Motif scaffolding. Structure first.
Motif, PDB file in Angstrom:
ATOM      1  N   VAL A   1       0.324  -9.434   6.184  1.00 54.51           N
ATOM      2  CA  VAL A   1       0.555  -9.029   4.800  1.00 54.51           C
ATOM      3  C   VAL A   1      -0.752  -8.841   4.026  1.00 54.51           C
ATOM      4  CG1 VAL A   1       0.684 -11.303   3.698  1.00 54.51           C
ATOM      5  CG2 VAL A   1       2.062  -9.411   2.819  1.00 54.51           C
ATOM      6  N   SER A   2      -1.810  -9.525   4.455  1.00 51.16           N
ATOM      7  CA  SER A   2      -3.109  -9.395   3.804  1.00 51.16           C
ATOM      8  C   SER A   2      -3.700  -8.004   3.994  1.00 51.16           C
ATOM      9  CB  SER A   2      -4.079 -10.440   4.355  1.00 51.16           C
ATOM     10  OG  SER A   2      -4.504 -10.090   5.660  1.00 51.16           O
ATOM     11  N   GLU A   3      -3.135  -7.262   4.939  1.00 55.13           N
ATOM     12  CA  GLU A   3      -3.616  -5.934   5.301  1.00 55.13           C
ATOM     13  C   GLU A   3      -2.851  -4.821   4.592  1.00 55.13           C
ATOM     14  OE1 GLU A   3      -5.380  -5.474   9.027  1.00 55.13           O
ATOM     15  OE2 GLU A   3      -4.471  -7.274   9.899  1.00 55.13           O
ATOM     16  N   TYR A   4      -1.953  -5.201   3.690  1.00 54.87           N
ATOM     17  CA  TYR A   4      -1.194  -4.224   2.920  1.00 54.87           C
ATOM     18  C   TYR A   4      -1.452  -4.380   1.434  1.00 54.87           C
ATOM     19  CZ  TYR A   4       1.633  -3.369   7.125  1.00 54.87           C
ATOM     20  OH  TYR A   4       2.060  -3.045   8.390  1.00 54.87           O
ATOM     21  N   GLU A   5      -0.800  -3.536   0.644  1.00 56.28           N
ATOM     22  CA  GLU A   5      -0.970  -3.568  -0.797  1.00 56.28           C
ATOM     23  C   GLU A   5       0.385  -3.662  -1.466  1.00 56.28           C
ATOM     24  OE1 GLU A   5      -3.519  -1.131  -4.208  1.00 56.28           O
ATOM     25  OE2 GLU A   5      -2.960  -0.147  -2.334  1.00 56.28           O
ATOM     26  N   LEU A   6       0.817  -4.894  -1.703  1.00 53.74           N
ATOM     27  CA  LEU A   6       2.067  -5.137  -2.396  1.00 53.74           C
ATOM     28  C   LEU A   6       1.914  -4.740  -3.855  1.00 53.74           C
ATOM     29  CD1 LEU A   6       3.031  -8.526  -0.733  1.00 53.74           C
ATOM     30  CD2 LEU A   6       3.352  -6.170   0.055  1.00 53.74           C
ATOM     31  N   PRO A   7       2.999  -4.270  -4.479  1.00 55.80           N
ATOM     32  CA  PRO A   7       2.853  -3.941  -5.897  1.00 55.80           C
ATOM     33  C   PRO A   7       2.845  -5.204  -6.746  1.00 55.80           C
ATOM     34  CG  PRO A   7       5.091  -3.531  -5.168  1.00 55.80           C
ATOM     35  CD  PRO A   7       4.291  -3.825  -3.933  1.00 55.80           C
ATOM     36  N   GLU A   8       1.827  -5.372  -7.582  1.00 60.05           N
ATOM     37  CA  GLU A   8       1.784  -6.524  -8.470  1.00 60.05           C
ATOM     38  C   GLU A   8       2.178  -6.093  -9.873  1.00 60.05           C
ATOM     39  OE1 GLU A   8      -1.941  -8.573  -8.656  1.00 60.05           O
ATOM     40  OE2 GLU A   8      -1.225 -10.024 -10.137  1.00 60.05           O
ATOM     41  N   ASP A   9       3.043  -6.885 -10.494  1.00 64.18           N
ATOM     42  CA  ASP A   9       3.640  -6.546 -11.776  1.00 64.18           C
ATOM     43  C   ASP A   9       3.695  -7.793 -12.644  1.00 64.18           C
ATOM     44  OD1 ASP A   9       5.190  -5.712 -13.969  1.00 64.18           O
ATOM     45  OD2 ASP A   9       6.376  -4.347 -12.733  1.00 64.18           O
ATOM     46  N   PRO A  10       2.702  -7.955 -13.531  1.00 68.56           N
ATOM     47  CA  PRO A  10       2.515  -9.157 -14.349  1.00 68.56           C
ATOM     48  C   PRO A  10       3.772  -9.578 -15.102  1.00 68.56           C
ATOM     49  CG  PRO A  10       0.651  -7.709 -14.601  1.00 68.56           C
ATOM     50  CD  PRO A  10       1.653  -6.953 -13.784  1.00 68.56           C
ATOM     51  N   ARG A  11       4.693  -8.650 -15.323  1.00 67.72           N
ATOM     52  CA  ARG A  11       5.957  -8.992 -15.955  1.00 67.72           C
ATOM     53  C   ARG A  11       6.784  -9.857 -15.008  1.00 67.72           C
TER      54      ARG A  11
ATOM     55  N   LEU B   1      14.522 -11.810 -10.904  1.00 76.00           N
ATOM     56  CA  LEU B   1      13.974 -12.821 -11.801  1.00 76.00           C
ATOM     57  C   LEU B   1      12.454 -12.880 -11.718  1.00 76.00           C
ATOM     58  CD1 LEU B   1      16.524 -15.742 -11.382  1.00 76.00           C
ATOM     59  CD2 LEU B   1      16.598 -13.742 -12.883  1.00 76.00           C
ATOM     60  N   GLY B   2      11.923 -12.612 -10.531  1.00 77.07           N
ATOM     61  CA  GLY B   2      10.492 -12.658 -10.309  1.00 77.07           C
ATOM     62  C   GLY B   2      10.145 -12.320  -8.875  1.00 77.07           C
ATOM     63  N   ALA B   3       8.863 -12.414  -8.539  1.00 78.06           N
ATOM     64  CA  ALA B   3       8.407 -12.089  -7.194  1.00 78.06           C
ATOM     65  C   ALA B   3       7.032 -12.672  -6.903  1.00 78.06           C
ATOM     66  CB  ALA B   3       8.388 -10.587  -6.996  1.00 78.06           C
ATOM     67  N   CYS B   4       6.814 -13.049  -5.649  1.00 77.14           N
ATOM     68  CA  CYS B   4       5.518 -13.535  -5.206  1.00 77.14           C
ATOM     69  C   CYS B   4       4.879 -12.544  -4.250  1.00 77.14           C
ATOM     70  CB  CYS B   4       5.655 -14.897  -4.537  1.00 77.14           C
ATOM     71  SG  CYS B   4       6.497 -16.117  -5.554  1.00 77.14           S
ATOM     72  N   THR B   5       3.941 -11.755  -4.758  1.00 79.88           N
ATOM     73  CA  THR B   5       3.366 -10.682  -3.968  1.00 79.88           C
ATOM     74  C   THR B   5       1.946 -11.027  -3.544  1.00 79.88           C
ATOM     75  OG1 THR B   5       2.589  -9.527  -5.953  1.00 79.88           O
ATOM     76  CG2 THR B   5       4.755  -8.938  -5.122  1.00 79.88           C
ATOM     77  N   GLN B   6       1.410 -12.116  -4.078  1.00 83.99           N
ATOM     78  CA  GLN B   6       0.042 -12.482  -3.756  1.00 83.99           C
ATOM     79  C   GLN B   6      -0.039 -13.886  -3.157  1.00 83.99           C
ATOM     80  OE1 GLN B   6      -1.583 -10.022  -3.454  1.00 83.99           O
ATOM     81  NE2 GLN B   6      -0.722  -8.605  -4.959  1.00 83.99           N
ATOM     82  N   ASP B   7      -1.205 -14.206  -2.601  1.00 85.08           N
ATOM     83  CA  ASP B   7      -1.464 -15.493  -1.957  1.00 85.08           C
ATOM     84  C   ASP B   7      -0.352 -15.915  -1.001  1.00 85.08           C
ATOM     85  OD1 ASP B   7      -2.994 -17.751  -1.435  1.00 85.08           O
ATOM     86  OD2 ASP B   7      -2.082 -18.922  -3.048  1.00 85.08           O
ATOM     87  N   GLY B   8       0.051 -14.995  -0.132  1.00 87.47           N
ATOM     88  CA  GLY B   8       1.048 -15.291   0.879  1.00 87.47           C
ATOM     89  C   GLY B   8       2.034 -14.169   1.146  1.00 87.47           C
ATOM     90  N   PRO B   9       3.124 -14.489   1.860  1.00 86.74           N
ATOM     91  CA  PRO B   9       4.201 -13.562   2.217  1.00 86.74           C
ATOM     92  C   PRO B   9       4.962 -13.092   0.984  1.00 86.74           C
ATOM     93  CG  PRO B   9       4.257 -15.529   3.591  1.00 86.74           C
ATOM     94  CD  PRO B   9       3.335 -15.819   2.453  1.00 86.74           C
ATOM     95  N   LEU B  10       5.618 -11.943   1.088  1.00 86.06           N
ATOM     96  CA  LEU B  10       6.348 -11.377  -0.037  1.00 86.06           C
ATOM     97  C   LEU B  10       7.663 -12.104  -0.298  1.00 86.06           C
ATOM     98  CD1 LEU B  10       6.956  -9.263  -2.209  1.00 86.06           C
ATOM     99  CD2 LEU B  10       7.678  -7.712  -0.399  1.00 86.06           C
TER     100      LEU B  10
END
Ligand SMILES: COc1cc(CCc2cc(NC(=O)c3ccc(N4C[C@@H](C)N[C@@H](C)C4)cc3)[nH]n2)cc(OC)c1
Ligand SMILES: [Mg+2]
Length: 308
Positions: free
Chosen positions: A4-14, A92-101
């Motif tokens: 996952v570190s090799e991809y670009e997950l969408p990050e959305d501060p909301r 409700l939310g999402a964890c796209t950074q510092d680990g798996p999606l």
């Protein structure tokens, strides 16, 4: 497939949430699209940063491919566009950074509508046997119609957002602790490849018993094709989690649908409600009622239906 570190997950501060704000728990269900756990989110609402909220965290599996990842992202992204309704599984939310999606969704404590109903079957004769070892209180005649009403408002909303479910079933309707019907898996991406017809699901369910004929032969999915499936869902409701087309095999189902064969009325079901099923099961897609109508009718029926 790659890390996952090799991809670009969408990050959305909301929607983004720190991983240290999630307290993972027991699994809730597995599937071909991935794993879902019960979890506790700390300070989800950050007007209350010391609040804990029970949530459902959906994630990929060990064998997940690059296709599976893209589907989970697309599922998350589209739920944002569709928006919020009381009667759907909301983002409700999402964890796209510092680990798996991780994709955080509303948590329905009482499982799906099928097992919900089956665990509340009275030991009479109008229904089959309760397969649950923890039977709950049976539902009233208005609870069942109200149950159908909530599924209609959710689908009506999805329809208004130009969303086509393509697999509306009782297994895809979840129930919360307050007995609210929430439609699930409406955000899944449609596969580009041709789909099998004798391809049971993770729970061993044939998705062809919910498909409209046009979606079955010509593979044409519309809002009306979802109305067909709503008729089948209605049947599941008033059979309390019964299985569609009993005794009818897969390969013979294509013939009889073309010949105009429909399911018989369940034991405890009013003629009005069965007439609604028939309108949904119309051979002509443009003659089936819209969800707007279905919501209008059911709302009237709920008013007339009794608790007693
Ligand atoms: C695979 O990704 C998903 C994600 C979702 C949305 C996220 C979600 C999942 C849930 N909820 C459960 O998964 C759940 C909860 C209780 C269950 N049960 C266990 C049963 C034996 N007893 C019952 C008393 C309760 C069984 C399952 N909420 N939100 C739905 C889904 O569907 C098709 C699949
Ligand atoms: Mg399933």
């Amino acid at each position: 497939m790659a890390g996952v570190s090799e991809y670009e997950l969408p990050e959305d501060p909301r929607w983004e949430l720190p991983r240290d704000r999630l307290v993972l728990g027991k699994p809730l269900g597995e599937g071909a699209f991935g794993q879902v756990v019960l979890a506790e989110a700390i300070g989800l609402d950050k007007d209350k940063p010391n609040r804990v909220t029970k949530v459902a965290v959906k994630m990929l599996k060990s064998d997940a491919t690059e296709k599976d990842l893209s589907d989970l992202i697309s599922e998350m992204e589209m739920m944002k566009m569709i928006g919020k309704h009381k009667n759907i599984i909301n983002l409700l939310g999402a964890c796209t950074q510092d680990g798996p999606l991780y994709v955080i969704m509303e948590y329905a404590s009482k499982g799906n509508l099928r097992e919900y109903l089956q665990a509340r079957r009275p030991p009479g004769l109008e229904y089959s046997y309760n397969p649950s070892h923890n039977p709950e209180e049976q539902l009233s005649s208005k609870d069942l119609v109200s149950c159908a009403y909530q599924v209609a408002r959710g689908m009506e909303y999805l329809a208004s957002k130009k969303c086509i479910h393509r697999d509306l079933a009782a297994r895809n309707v979840l129930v919360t602790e307050d007995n609210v019907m929430k439609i699930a898996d409406f955000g899944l991406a449609r596969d580009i490849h041709h789909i099998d017809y004798y391809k049971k699901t993770t729970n061993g369910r044939l998705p062809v018993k919910w498909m409209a004929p046009e979606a079955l032969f010509d593979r044409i999915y519309t809002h009306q094709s979802d109305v067909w499936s709503f008729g089948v869902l209605l049947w599941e409701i008033f059979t309390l989690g019964g299985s569609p087309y009993p005794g009818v095999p897969v390969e013979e189902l294509f013939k009889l649908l073309k010949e105009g064969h429909r399911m018989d009325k369940p034991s405890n079901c009013t003629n009005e409600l069965y007439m609604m099923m028939r309108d949904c099961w119309h051979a002509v897609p443009s003659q089936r009622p819209t969800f707007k109508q279905l919501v209008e009718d059911l709302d009237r029926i709920v008013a007339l239906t009794s608790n007693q």
